[PDB]
Structure 1
Amino acid sequence: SMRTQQKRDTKFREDXPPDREELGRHSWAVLHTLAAYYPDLPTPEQQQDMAQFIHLFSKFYPXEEXAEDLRKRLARNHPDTRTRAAFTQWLXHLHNEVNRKLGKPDFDXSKVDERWRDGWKDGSXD
């Protein structure tokens, strides 16, 4: 017909303020990448710090409906920051809660180390 609601076909300037979706994509990348490299045997101070980091992220996330949704989840399901394995998985399952809320499919949590740190075992990241 003429205009389109597919943003990629419309708004071409990259250096603009992130919208709700684009901030989401950046933020999941930041959180999953921070978790991917977290210690396998973190100190007690690290475990405390990472839980506080996720709590503070929930206080300041600037999409208010998204931040409320996050604060509700963290109240029902505190972050497991005991180890890399536990925290990476914990964060995957949380991300999946949001995906299911929004009508998106589940990400296979078995893929989190490939996806965010190591690259796919088939070599498609090289």
Structure 2
Amino acid sequence: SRTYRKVDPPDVEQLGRSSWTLLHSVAASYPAQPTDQQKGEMKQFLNIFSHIYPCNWCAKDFEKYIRENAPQVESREELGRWMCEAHNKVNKKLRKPKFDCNFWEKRWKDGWD
């Protein structure tokens, strides 16, 4: 109330945009040549994320997606592409335009100049 303005909990939409920001940013700072431990932790991270993501149907669907499309974690390029395709699967459901994954790296890593 006092120190901070009263703000309502995020809706599914706000949770989503916040969460893609984290997901794509995690991929953008993943190594080009990850260690075995980094590969395993990334797979584990995404598996648990799919269990705990705080939208029921979002999480359930994402778990099924991972089961059917194993995360590609051999390099940042692969993981970034995997994340882009995963995000595009959701865009397709929600009747959002397909994002061109050739721009994933500019959008989430390098910027536009």
Is TM > 0.5 for Structure 1 vs Structure 2?
yes
Which runs of 5 or more residues in structure 1 are unaligned?
A: 1-12, 122-126
Q: Which amino acid aligns with 1:118?
A: D
Cα distance between partner residues in 2 of 1:15 and 1:41: 41
Alignment counterpart, residue 49 of structure 1, candidates 32, 41, 46 = 41
Cα distance between partner residues in 2 of 1:120 and 1:86: 21
Runs of 4+ in 1 over 4 A off after TM superposition: none
1:25 lines up with 2:10 in the alignment: no
> How big is the shift at 1:14?
7.7
Cα distance between partner residues in 2 of 1:28 and 1:113: 14
Alignment-derived partner of residue 52 in structure 2: 60
1:110 lines up with 2:102 in the alignment: yes
Q: Which amino acid aligns with 1:91?
A: M
> How big is the shift at 1:62?
1.1
Cα distance between partner residues in 2 of 1:14 and 1:57: 28
Alignment-derived partner of residue 91 in structure 1: 83
Which runs of 5 or more residues in structure 2 are unaligned?
A: none
RMSD across aligned positions (CA):
1.2
Q: Which amino acid aligns with 1:55?
A: N
| TM-score, reference length from structure 2 | 0.92
Structure ranking higher in helix proportion: 2
Q: Which amino acid aligns with 2:90?
A: V
Q: Which amino acid aligns with 2:15?
A: L
| TM-score, reference length from structure 1 | 0.83
Larger RCO (CA within 8 A; separation ≥ 6): 2
Alignment-derived partner of residue 75 in structure 1: 67
> How big is the shift at 1:16?
2.2
> How big is the shift at 1:65?
0.8
Q: Which amino acid aligns with 2:95?
A: G
Larger Rg: 1
Q: Which amino acid aligns with 2:103?
A: K
